[PDB]
Design a protein around this nucleic acid. Structure first.
Lengths: 135, 135, 135, 135, 135, 135
DNA sequence: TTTTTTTTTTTTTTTTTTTT
DNA sequence: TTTTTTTTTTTTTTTTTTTT
């Protein structure tokens, strides 16, 4: 266990080196509870920093990390931020992947595979049932 | 055993020389009991000095030190201070590391790997259990 | 020998695959004589196409190509175009390299190592002589 | 010989890696003629880009480079810019060094050792003569 | 054996000359029994003088001294004085070192390496046991 | 010759290491012309920075430096500043020494031996003549 | 023939790159 | 006496048809 001021793919040694992803690969698993959010500015745009209890795991090393702060990429950030608003404490758990990206300045794009089944409306459930009926 | 007025990475000869860390490395192991804290001012900001029984160990020399005073870096200081308040006596034990830090005035950043398992809520334990279930 | 309508790094199989250059590497050697130039438009901007006698050589295969048309990258294009104007026939010979490029959409940047010694003024020759004098 | 769009310590592979200079070391030798200057803006401030004939030499590899553009560090930039103004063509030649710099974000500071003897007033020449007289 | 009115680093010829310590060095070994203490005033502050049986040994000469009075530096003085109170007779034994001290008016700082194992609480013993368990 | 932004004993490698001067020793020779002065603030007090043409020479290496800025110790600073006021250009030349200093935080004190004979009143000249008469 | 000299809190960190 | 800062970047390449 390593205590970190802020939990990032770089802190937990999961950020790939540029032009290094030849196949889809998992990097980290991040789970925790979120109490609040704050918006900050950087050279590359605005970002959200989360407050709560967070644990992190690298998969090429098995190292386990823990923090009270979390900065995620923009996609996971958008999803979680849409999932949190106000005084409610939000539980989350996700596995972060890396995929090759031609026409990318880094050569990879991040993927998101959640580990908690998310909420789906009864209507799309009906659609899945209809699909599973014919064939 | 060497008795020191105050226990620091510099006292126990663990402070790296600037621009000297090429790979992650452990410097010291510090354990003790804390009775109180005091806040002091310096050129570079405020700092906390701890009172109690403290023992220290360098890893490149095996030298063992002991003191009744302790000054830590800011991160460990914040964690321990949040862990101590009032008349209670707090036991602690940590291993201090050094990591390279590009864009740093010293070239390194300190790491914290505790040796006593810290307290985690039942909720995050449930999250870890859920993660360990699928795969 | 393979006759090609237009000589390009893609025609002679020298264009690297995106996110594939880990170290500096030579791709092709191109030499020929230039009689004229024409300017054309594409999605990514304007380009110059050269007319004359051109031969090309891949270095990972030894394959030899020959054409009467030549399209080069923008840097080599600028140099050669500045070297050609009017009815004069211009001889040229260059070796094309590939270098890693972080923050690049392809991961590499092209290099130019000429094989004919280019023209340098007597003044810079004097400067080189002065440099070679002290030490 | 390698032709480069702009000549920099990074282009000619002379820029040291952060936290790598343990002793004073020469990196490059740059000589050329300057015809004009242009001022540009970046994240870290304004910079001057020079136009003319420039040749460069790395000392750990012997590689020789040549360009028509030149961007230098701020100190050499200030000196040369003060040395150039208007339509005059300015000859210059300098050897660039690297020195350790505690309290530096990179760990090194650049040095300048010119290879052409610069201009000194007759008064300071008189001073040097007086110094060389007593002892 | 040399009998001295008061035992000091100066009496036993162990006090370093200013600006003379280039590396850590042992100066003296002092052991004895303490019966009482007295507080005295000087230009540089107050000091404690001890009464009992004291023997001293220089390490660069092997000379052996003995006295019934003892004046120590402030750190050893504080430790021993905290170790003595009342009619009890206190046994002690310590080795005195010298360490370089930049920003010091003498260039050195004294070190204390006791030769009798001191008293440590069962709690810190438990901590040392826990530390010695994981790795 | 090395061009430096500011000329100091540290820039020209003349500053002694603490607790290193065992005998009087010359470090540097500094001569130049002064056009103006500016007052700046630091942690340790205010200081004067000089503008003009300055050359410097280390004596343990023979290295020669040159700058347009100069910061001196407090004594030389006071003397020169008293020697400069207004639009006049002031010529100066001095040899800087180092002397042991017991009760000093560095172990040395700087000395000043000018190389240009300074101005003495006719009265003190008369005194020297009277002294040289009797014996 | 004497009490004299020794010590100081220092440094260490920063959001960055990923997508189109 | 000590300090009195210094450096980082300052982009690249992609295509530019071909056959029936």
């Amino acid at each position: 266990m390593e205590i970190v001021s802020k939990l990032t793919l770089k802190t937990i040694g999961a950020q790939p080196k540029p032009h290094s992803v030849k196949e889809n690969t998992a990097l980290a698993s991040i789970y925790g509870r979120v109490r609040g959010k704050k918006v900050g500015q950087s050279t590359f745009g605005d970002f959200i920093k989360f407050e709560g209890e967070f644990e992190g795991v690298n998969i090429a090393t098995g190292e386990v990390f823990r923090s009270g702060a979390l900065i995620l990429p923009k996609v996971l950030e958008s999803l979680l931020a849409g999932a949190v608003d106000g005084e409610n404490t939000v539980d989350f758990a996700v596995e972060i992947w890396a995929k090759p990206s031609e026409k990318g300045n880094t050569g990879y794009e991040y993927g998101v595979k959640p580990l908690i089944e998310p909420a789906a409306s009864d209507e799309l459930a009906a659609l899945r049932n209809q699909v599973k009926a014919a064939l």
